[PDB]
Symmetry: T
Subunit: 143 residues, 12 copies
């Protein structure tokens, strides 16, 4: 059985109950539930985790590197800013799928650049919360 | 019933039987078949079309604009170069999902820029041919 | 008698019946009619032609170069992208007036740059469809 | 009856009797006369004014803003340099047509950028003095 | 009664007892006292908090977003670097005043750019510690 | 007794009775009155002056340099354009506070750059007309 | 026997009978003849083809990729603009020699950049029509 | 007899009695005297004039253009900012020598760029007030 | 006796047992041991510490600033990203030696820029783990 | 009889016996021999010279300028760096062919820029040592 | 008695007998003579030297640094390229006057940048050979 | 026994007896002595050489490439300017350590870029003359 780490970065704990015009009306706990529901359908286990702490994100990335498990990562603002987080992600031997809820190319110019994309397997942007469900489906087929 | 236009741009007719290291071993005719198989599973119809001609691509974009049908577009090198094709795509009232087979951010700097992303609903890159199957699944849920 | 070639590039066949907020409510066939009406008033003949095909546009540019006739060209997205079309236009010995319906300077930064302006006699932007009628009036006085 | 303010910026008082290779052989007083002749033909009144003083130009822009009258403005070198003059022009509620006698895109790179274009209704460049007559004709139709 | 959150970012706990040539001789505890003294004079309550932890700053921003209370934020080096902190601040519905003690425009070029200014109500720089007292006075009048 | 020169640059004579959405509903004469009212409260004298003329602004800057009096300067569009005005301001030996009514960082990219900030004591932006009252309060304490 | 594809892009059908000051007085049909004459001397066969159509150029590139035959390509304005054409050329397993008639470095800055050079075996510029004869001689020795 | 116009731009009326560390201890009236003393020695007449007004500078440039007399111009901050003043100077048929008192290349990056240098005969910078005496000596030999 | 703080930033806890091709086969605990062995040889004491937390790094920098002790800092990805960490380091009165294990100039363009180098005493890059031993030897001689 | 100067710049004395993967297995003495063999076939004389000294290269360029003889120049790293060498080459009245052995466009970005190309007759890159033989053949026909 | 070193860099040995349209018809030996004639008039001694060798130029700069004598330096193409030569010049304790014969601002963009200007006392450009005579006159007064 | 080439570029012959504030009070002959003293301690031989001549530096680089011996290179201003010297250094099969005495990142922006760093084993900057002693110690351990 494949175990998949879903990791949300800064501010995404406020999903759904804040800024529904931007990031959608699904809350972080509902997101967790949808991911676990889809994982069961696919015969996988999803571990869904969110933190505002870069140190804490790096630790979760490290652990998935040690376990050789895949990661679906929405790093929030750290996508555009963190070399630390890119270098922890570059270490992963299993696939890394980068997810943005919003279309980061329809926004400010600075969101169009990701430290993560070049070292990710692939990227999904602007498809809302389905982004994560779709990433999980890719990883279920690419084992 | 939703009808979805899958549109491939220049060079992608050579899929699978050329450059399998880059764009994967699935051929364009197999791609068509996989998309039509998945469409049936989802209760949709996919019209899958490829052209090396920008004029011909624009016509297919126009027709989907007139029908208000969604489009999954992998525009190939025109992604990075064509304002004409962006302005035809900007006209679409149904969702437009941009797909790249390869991760265009792990390549030359010029592939990191898309004329299409800012006017697309969303973007999927680097997930190979599954990219298209995943886009089709989003569009099946977002009706 | 002066003969004037009016040449519309990609997407402008959809004028008026699409995107009236941007490019105005005059359709391409009405545009043709207004140009031919104004040409008669001025004692000229206008040949009004539109194509989504760069190859086809180049051929029409070539023919006007061979006839030494003037051209009013709205190249659409190719304004910002095509060196091919600029080099065919650079060949014209009679005047070349560049026309944009929309004000391309009140839009995305990329529309502010034209390959054509430097080799054109002159440029008219943002005055809608009158742009073309005004270009025709200049060419009637500059013979 | 429409009243139209034609406003010339620095150095354009020297028109025609200087630099005829660049800006044409029509003098500023002849320019005035041609504009007033064309205005009568169109059933409008043109007030044609030139100043080397940015303060004086701003005052003339202010007055047209207060009267809600249109403006045809050739700001000369201030086109490329003045945010003050752009912000006075941005205030106009009637149309603002930017005019350059010369084709500013066939010259030094710095002339290709205008502070005024983004806030103008439209722009006419390189059509010489007819530029102004054509702008007046647009404003006569867009009332 | 208005409650105002004053939030200091990395390194500003060392105020006054370090680098008095740059950031002034007022210490962080004296800063707190001056802010609370001025708040009483104005009939408001100030909650003054400092942290070297971006995670901790984000939490304090979140809480003010939930309470709809205003914030005076001096984010220190994170002003120039953090998209995470900008996106938490963008969420605030009450006013956000950005404060720098030093004039960040008289220093290295990189300090001249703030992620925060575009989403702030306003900015006060280079007026030392009075910066904060002045921000508090604005917020007292803008309720 | 401290005397403070408040100097407004181009277009700001139109305050309040124009563009109230941008620069607020306070007129220039009301601005004067509010500044003189606050000056009395603070035991200072404010000399409040506005001009559309760069030459006239430079003269007022010169006079304050000769008197060694402080200046609150909102230079309008000249903030982003004038080296002349910066070099006159650099001469001031008493404090210079730069004021913008609007938040110039939430607007076009060109307004984010000031010739004045690097040579000013400090800057206040986006706090509307209170900007000036707050600058006056700083200068009252920094004597 | 080596077969070599000589491929000319947009506008080069007008060679010699147009713009002899820039591209020389040899016409496209004479070019063909000179290339076939030189090929016989070298014991090779040259297939010389020109098109204004990017789609048509891509097809000719595809065919040479399938045959593993070399290509001498002068892509005209598409040299500086087309990623599509670069990606078809990148596929060639036999040598690709890029040819410009004119010295593209003695012209506008934009002609100094080629999408093709990085994926070509080599480049020959500014040696006029001999460019092609020289490329053919290289390919005759590098088999 | 040669007549030479020496023209000083904004802020240079304050020479010598202000900022002697930067621009030297010679006052504007002493500068005038030194220039007239040197002119007599050389058998020329110098007309030495200073203005803070761009309009006034343009008028003095115009007059020298009409008289075909040479100009020594220190435009102050307008050197780096004014296209208006460059275009009036470009009109001069006699030599134009650009003078800076200070070495503008040992200062802020923005002072290293002059609108005037490209259209001047020559430039003298950083040699203080002798700059002007040396320019006058060149013009005495180049008649 | 000199006390030297050796401080490792994000991801460097994984040294040696991960990515030995990049950062070498020495683990973080072996690194500690080698540094303490060399310190004894030199008559110094090394305090060797690693953290993934920017807040924690800043605290360790603060403490060395308060003790006026030197620091050898390998900040990992924060080298290229953190102004916070630069400003804490700028405070150090004893020497600061920046160390990179890898040669950061033989890698991606973004690693070639350090916030730390300009405020460091000196920099050592690409000499692997010896980097640290060499920095310690410099600090032993520069007391 | 035409005399042709073949001039090799820094490091190219090491040809063939060093870095055969990059610059090919032909040594500098073999290069000389091949060039002299081809010159005899063509009825010309080649003078083949190499130097690591820019001063020495300039002297050889000077001599060919004085003799009005053509030059084939591979300047090595000086191609991308030397304005001195460009200005000596600009003086040549006979043709100058720039040669690179390697394709300088398939390498680091800095090799893509040549000081020499704009003033050369033409350029040949990436065709190895044949580059020189081909340049000699052009010069034999262009006399 | 003041001794002044006049130092000419690469290519300037060819003065006057080459490129008289650019650098004037005075030869290097005549230049020497004019400088020595003017030096006698001024009561100074000029040592006039030219070299194509950067090493040789550096030695002459070194010697003037050791003697604390002034230098008039026209470095030719090395002006725009050499940090070595700038750092030798930065060492001079007596004045350094940079001279260009041609106006380097009316030419290619790359000539507008000098490594030398920022460390020179002053710069004289475009005044031909008089440049040197004028520099000598400054140095005679500034002792 | 390891032989190590220590190579100093332009201006560094003047070490210690010039510019002691920048490059330290150790002279070039003392530098030699310290390096030879340290080499004996380490059981190596150092050959220490300095030249102002790029040609001479290239020859010394060539010889070390032929001997497969390591090099410690401080190239002076050529660090930032010379592609020739980089390409000779790229040839070295033994380690190349780049040394700067000064911290080149605390200086002008242009010194922050090295042609050498990307092809060096490693870099040591700002540690003064110890830089060289430390490089020698690395090379003694990395054999
Ligand atoms: O589109 C996305 O998922 C992002 O990665 C999310 C971010 C999210 C910021 C989080 O802010 C929130 C605030 C309230 C509710 C949800 C998210 C942003 O920093 C990236 O540019 C785009
Ligand atoms: O990754 C993708 O799908 C692309 O959009 C595809 C392109 C495809 C070029 C097509 O070339 C092929 C050649 C042989 C076989 C398949 C594709 C390229 O121009 C884009 O940068 C990335
Ligand atoms: O303003 C103009 O006329 C343009 O040249 C027109 C374009 C037109 C695109 C055509 O799109 C249309 C779609 C529907 C209806 C009419 C036009 C655009 O690509 C240029 O930037 C500006
Ligand atoms: O092309 C135009 O009308 C301009 O706006 C006019 C300008 C005119 C400068 C005026 O100079 C003159 C000098 C003598 C005679 C007429 C004009 C220039 O600064 C703009 O770039 C282009
Ligand atoms: O001027 C300000 O208040 C800043 O926002 C403060 C910062 C403060 C850094 C904190 O460093 C300190 C060190 C010792 C004492 C006080 C502050 C800096 O990173 C910003 O560019 C400007
Ligand atoms: O925000 C400010 O105070 C400004 O300095 C004001 C300006 C004001 C322009 C004046 O325009 C007005 C027009 C009507 C009413 C008030 C002001 C603008 O040029 C600066 O970018 C920002
Ligand atoms: O120098 C060359 O061969 C070019 O590749 C040719 C082009 C040719 C354009 C074709 O235009 C012609 C027009 C009339 C006659 C011949 C060519 C141009 O777009 C490239 O920058 C340089
Ligand atoms: O170096 C020069 O002469 C300048 O052209 C003079 C200027 C002068 C500004 C005038 O300011 C003064 C203030 C007091 C006394 C004298 C001059 C400056 O704007 C240019 O960058 C350099
Ligand atoms: O070369 C170095 O020491 C670095 O400062 C280290 C970094 C280290 C990232 C840490 O990643 C590691 C992962 C596994 C094992 C060791 C390090 C990187 O972010 C800098 O660009 C260069
Ligand atoms: O491709 C070429 O011929 C070059 O002009 C040659 C150079 C040659 C450097 C010489 O290095 C060598 C080292 C060993 C053997 C041969 C050459 C390089 O600096 C240019 O970028 C490209
Ligand atoms: O204008 C000047 O004096 C220069 O410093 C001279 C140079 C001179 C190059 C020398 O070339 C010559 C060739 C023949 C005759 C005289 C000079 C050039 O590299 C600088 O950009 C401008
Ligand atoms: O810091 C270093 O060692 C340098 O590589 C040395 C240089 C040295 C220039 C030599 O100048 C000197 C002058 C007098 C005494 C010693 C050195 C400079 O060009 C580099 O940017 C930094």
């Amino acid at each position: 059985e494949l175990i998949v780490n879903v990791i949300n970065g800064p501010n995404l704990g406020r999903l759904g109950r804040r800024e529904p015009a931007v990031y959608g009306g699904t809350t972080h706990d509902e997101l967790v539930a949808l991911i676990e529901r889809e994982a069961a359908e696919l015969g996988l286990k999803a571990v869904v985790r969110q933190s505002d702490s870069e140190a804490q994100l790096l630790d979760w990335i490290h652990q998935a590197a040690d376990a050789a498990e895949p990661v679906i990562l929405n790093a929030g603002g750290l996508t555009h800013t963190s070399v630390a987080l890119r270098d922890a992600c570059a270490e992963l031997s299993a696939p890394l799928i980068e997810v943005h809820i919003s279309n980061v190319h329809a926004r400010e110019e600075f969101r169009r650049h990701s430290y993560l994309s070049p070292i990710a397997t692939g990227v999904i942007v602007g498809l809302g919360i389905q982004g994560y469900l779709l990433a999980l489906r890719y990883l279920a087929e690419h084992v």
